[PDB]
Design brief:
Layout: E1 12-17, H1 20-28, E2 37-41, E3 49-53, H2 55-58, H3 68-74, E4 79-82, E5 85-86, E6 89-90, H4 93-106, E7 112-116, E8 119-123, H5 125-135, E9 148-150, H6 161-174, H7 184-206, E10 210-215, H8 218-227, E11 233-235, H9 241-246, H10 259-268, H11 281-288, H12 290-299, E12 317-322, E13 329-331, H13 332-357, E14 359-370, E15 379-384, H14 390-401, E16 412-429
The chain binds 2'-deoxyguanosine-5'-triphosphate and manganese (II) ion (MN) (2 copies).
One manganese (II) ion binds next to loops.
It binds a DNA duplex through strand 3, strand 6, strand 12 and strand 15.
PDB class: transferase/dna
Keywords: Polymerase, transferase, TRANSFERASE-DNA complex
Assembly: trimeric
Length: 430
DNA sequence: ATTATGACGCT
DNA sequence: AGCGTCAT
């Protein structure tokens, strides 16, 4: 009733770049533009592993985690760009720098939370109030929302996708009450106007296209963003949630795509997000824990409180390489050489970070995996990071891991190492 | 022999 | 602190 909070207090957007690494390579090399193309890491094994795919190539069934040789069977004309290799490993610097370009543009409009290399949440509540006071009760023209979809519309009473988009937008705009500056639907609409401007700025100033979601919280904004890709944005209103969730598989909601979501499905005997509404908060807490249970109870009603954190920079800076099958490291010289390669990349990135961002990392985390273990990490150990010196960090990493060598011969390494990882953490202002 | 990360929760 | 989960 009057006291039942509805989670409509904020306007939150999620901006995610379309096929990011592909767009970075297409900007650099115009010959790849408007083509089926993909970005690969390495080349000798099955043509390299695909990590990003243009929408033209997706039409042929090309996906991430596919080997390039197999993708070429689906799409013989597929074009490929390779990630840079430095010190024997993949180097993602080009894409991190392109990410900074986009993040700095978004930060002009509002404080952002960097959620990944290619996506950020935006809290637009205050910008929306400002724009509403500027509008002075003026209604919002469809011309201000030229790439916006309104989820759930059109409804009720022609055969083109753009025509349906405009039909839905006109239904939405016709139903709007522009007199009330507190109306959540109006606030979301103004938020979408701002996100159109943000996305136009990103494309004008970088050449990159993106999609976006606009809703009242982070989970709904992320889900909305996915509904109309590429190069479009989607408004998910509070009122759209019952219908949207009534056929939404639980795994589509961020954080429910793994073991927890599978357990929701199995324990409760349901398939769709909306079915969660029939359980009490205590029932959900009893199965999934106090925190998850409260989160699910609110989330299946469209309500989530997780704040957009003011954080534009990554919290950690890390370097990792797998050594699969026969390439696994089985000598001490090998382990030391590769720890040095990783540490040299880490030193480069840390020194640039300190110059750009006025901070220093203080803890070095070393992670390995040994032959046989299905786990991502077989062991993690931390030590002090007191100097941005690659030889020092590699010697310290070796010191903290060397007790894993069960070979009585110190020259051999047994079992062989199938992963090395170095991560700088615990930043302090400098 | 998908690979390279990065965030956050649990105990 | 070290380990697991989830994102992709
Ligand atoms: N190294 C590495 N990079 C990855 C991996 N998965 C994704 N990436 C990179 C390449 C992607 O372009 C970028 C952003 O990922 P997204 O999930 O947002 O997909 P992408 O932007 O490629 O396409 P989309 O957002 O669906 O239009 O992250 C991976 O497993 N390893
Ligand atoms: Mn993306
Ligand atoms: Mn993304």
């Amino acid at each position: 009733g009057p006291h039942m909070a509805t989670g409509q207090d904020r306007v939150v957007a999620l901006v995610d770049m379309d096929c990011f690494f592909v767009q970075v390579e297409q900007r650099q090399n115009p010959h790849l533009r408007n083509k089926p193309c993909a970005v690969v890491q390495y080349k000798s094994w099955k043509g390299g592993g695909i990590i990003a795919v243009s929408y033209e190539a997706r039409a042929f069934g090309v996906t991430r985690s596919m080997w390039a040789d197999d993708a070429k069977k689906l799409c013989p004309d597929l074009l490929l760009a390779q990630v840079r290799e430095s010190r024997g490993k993949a180097n993602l610097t080009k894409y991190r720098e392109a990410s900074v370009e986009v993040m700095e543009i978004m930060s002009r409009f509002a404080v952002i939370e960097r959620a990944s290399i290619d996506e950020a949440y935006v809290d637009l509540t205050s910008a929306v109030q400002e724009r509403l006071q500027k509008l002075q009760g003026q209604p919002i023209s469809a011309d201000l929302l030229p790439s916006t979809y309104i989820e759930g519309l059109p409804q009720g009473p022609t055969v083109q996708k753009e025509g349906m988009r405009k039909q839905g937008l006109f239904q939405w705009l016709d139903s709007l009450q522009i007199d009330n500056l507190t109306s959540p639907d109006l606030q979301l609409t103004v938020g979408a106007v701002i996100v159109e401007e943000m996305r136009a700025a990103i494309e004008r100033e970088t050449g990159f296209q993106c999609s976006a979601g606009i809703s009242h919280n982070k989970v709904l904004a992320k889900l909305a963003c996915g509904l109309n890709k590429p190069n479009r944005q989607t408004l998910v209103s509070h009122g759209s949630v019952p219908q949207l969730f009534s056929q939404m598989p639980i795994r589509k909601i961020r954080s429910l795509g793994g073991k927890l979501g599978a357990s929701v499905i199995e324990i409760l005997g349901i398939e769709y997000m909306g079915e969660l509404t029939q359980f009490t908060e205590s029932q959900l807490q009893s199965h999934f824990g106090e925190k998850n249970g409260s989160w699910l109870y609110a989330m299946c009603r469209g309500i989530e409180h997780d704040p957009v954190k003011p954080r534009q920079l990554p919290k950690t800076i890390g370097c990792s390489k797998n050594f699969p099958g026969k390439t696994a490291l089985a000598t001490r010289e090998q382990v030391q050489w590769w720890l040095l390669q990783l540490a040299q990349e880490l030193e480069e990135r840390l020194t640039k970070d300190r110059n750009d961002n006025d901070r220093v990392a203080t803890q070095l985390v070393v992670s390995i995996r040994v032959q046989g273990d299905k786990r991502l990490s077989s062991l993690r150990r931390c030590c002090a990071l007191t100097r941005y010196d690659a030889h020092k960090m590699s010697h310290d990493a070796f010191t903290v891991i060397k007790n894993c060598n069960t070979s009585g011969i110190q020259t051999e390494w047994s079992p062989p190492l199938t992963m090395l990882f170095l991560c700088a953490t615990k930043f302090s202002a400098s």
